[PDB]
């Protein structure tokens, strides 16, 4: 149990990595933000005008 109680906003603790990682790292690619799907769309605006 490391960092379990102090993660950056919308950070995800990859049990495989043992580190709260930010959605960004997976927002701009791989589009795998299940708990970040809301943040990714609110982190890298797109569609309808630019």
PDB file of C-alpha atoms in Angstrom:
ATOM      1  CA  UNK A   1       0.000   0.000   0.000  1.00  0.00           C
ATOM      2  CA  UNK A   2       2.073   2.899  -1.329  1.00  0.00           C
ATOM      3  CA  UNK A   3       0.603   6.350  -2.023  1.00  0.00           C
ATOM      4  CA  UNK A   4      -2.792   4.961  -1.025  1.00  0.00           C
ATOM      5  CA  UNK A   5      -4.003   8.297   0.312  1.00  0.00           C
ATOM      6  CA  UNK A   6      -2.591  11.147  -1.769  1.00  0.00           C
ATOM      7  CA  UNK A   7      -3.083  10.968  -5.522  1.00  0.00           C
ATOM      8  CA  UNK A   8      -3.049  13.839  -8.004  1.00  0.00           C
ATOM      9  CA  UNK A   9      -6.435  14.998  -9.217  1.00  0.00           C
ATOM     10  CA  UNK A  10      -7.958  12.328 -11.411  1.00  0.00           C
ATOM     11  CA  UNK A  11      -4.861  10.205 -10.931  1.00  0.00           C
ATOM     12  CA  UNK A  12      -5.107   6.443 -11.378  1.00  0.00           C
ATOM     13  CA  UNK A  13      -3.092   4.019  -9.264  1.00  0.00           C
ATOM     14  CA  UNK A  14      -2.098   1.367 -11.791  1.00  0.00           C
ATOM     15  CA  UNK A  15      -1.950  -1.695  -9.552  1.00  0.00           C
ATOM     16  CA  UNK A  16       0.440  -3.007 -12.200  1.00  0.00           C
ATOM     17  CA  UNK A  17       2.629   0.092 -11.949  1.00  0.00           C
ATOM     18  CA  UNK A  18       2.077   0.849  -8.255  1.00  0.00           C
ATOM     19  CA  UNK A  19       1.742   4.544  -8.948  1.00  0.00           C
ATOM     20  CA  UNK A  20      -1.092   6.957  -9.400  1.00  0.00           C
ATOM     21  CA  UNK A  21      -0.757   7.931 -13.032  1.00  0.00           C
ATOM     22  CA  UNK A  22      -2.594  10.871 -14.660  1.00  0.00           C
ATOM     23  CA  UNK A  23      -5.269  10.296 -17.323  1.00  0.00           C
ATOM     24  CA  UNK A  24      -3.299  12.488 -19.765  1.00  0.00           C
ATOM     25  CA  UNK A  25      -0.806   9.657 -20.217  1.00  0.00           C
ATOM     26  CA  UNK A  26      -3.693   7.613 -21.640  1.00  0.00           C
ATOM     27  CA  UNK A  27      -5.915  10.413 -22.902  1.00  0.00           C
ATOM     28  CA  UNK A  28      -3.847  11.457 -25.911  1.00  0.00           C
ATOM     29  CA  UNK A  29      -3.490   7.816 -26.931  1.00  0.00           C
ATOM     30  CA  UNK A  30      -4.837   4.306 -26.385  1.00  0.00           C
ATOM     31  CA  UNK A  31      -8.099   5.998 -25.326  1.00  0.00           C
ATOM     32  CA  UNK A  32      -8.423   3.657 -22.288  1.00  0.00           C
ATOM     33  CA  UNK A  33      -9.746   6.212 -19.698  1.00  0.00           C
ATOM     34  CA  UNK A  34     -12.644   4.351 -18.117  1.00  0.00           C
ATOM     35  CA  UNK A  35     -12.523   6.324 -14.867  1.00  0.00           C
ATOM     36  CA  UNK A  36     -11.061   9.233 -16.854  1.00  0.00           C
ATOM     37  CA  UNK A  37     -13.392   9.213 -19.883  1.00  0.00           C
ATOM     38  CA  UNK A  38     -14.908  12.308 -18.308  1.00  0.00           C
ATOM     39  CA  UNK A  39     -11.527  13.914 -17.648  1.00  0.00           C
ATOM     40  CA  UNK A  40      -9.973  12.977 -20.988  1.00  0.00           C
ATOM     41  CA  UNK A  41     -12.799  14.750 -22.789  1.00  0.00           C
ATOM     42  CA  UNK A  42     -12.196  17.626 -20.390  1.00  0.00           C
ATOM     43  CA  UNK A  43      -8.427  17.547 -20.767  1.00  0.00           C
ATOM     44  CA  UNK A  44      -7.887  17.475 -24.537  1.00  0.00           C
ATOM     45  CA  UNK A  45     -10.869  19.312 -26.015  1.00  0.00           C
ATOM     46  CA  UNK A  46     -11.756  18.397 -29.602  1.00  0.00           C
ATOM     47  CA  UNK A  47     -14.530  18.131 -32.195  1.00  0.00           C
ATOM     48  CA  UNK A  48     -16.770  21.017 -33.269  1.00  0.00           C
ATOM     49  CA  UNK A  49     -14.509  23.947 -33.951  1.00  0.00           C
ATOM     50  CA  UNK A  50     -10.891  24.246 -32.816  1.00  0.00           C
TER      51      UNK A  50
END
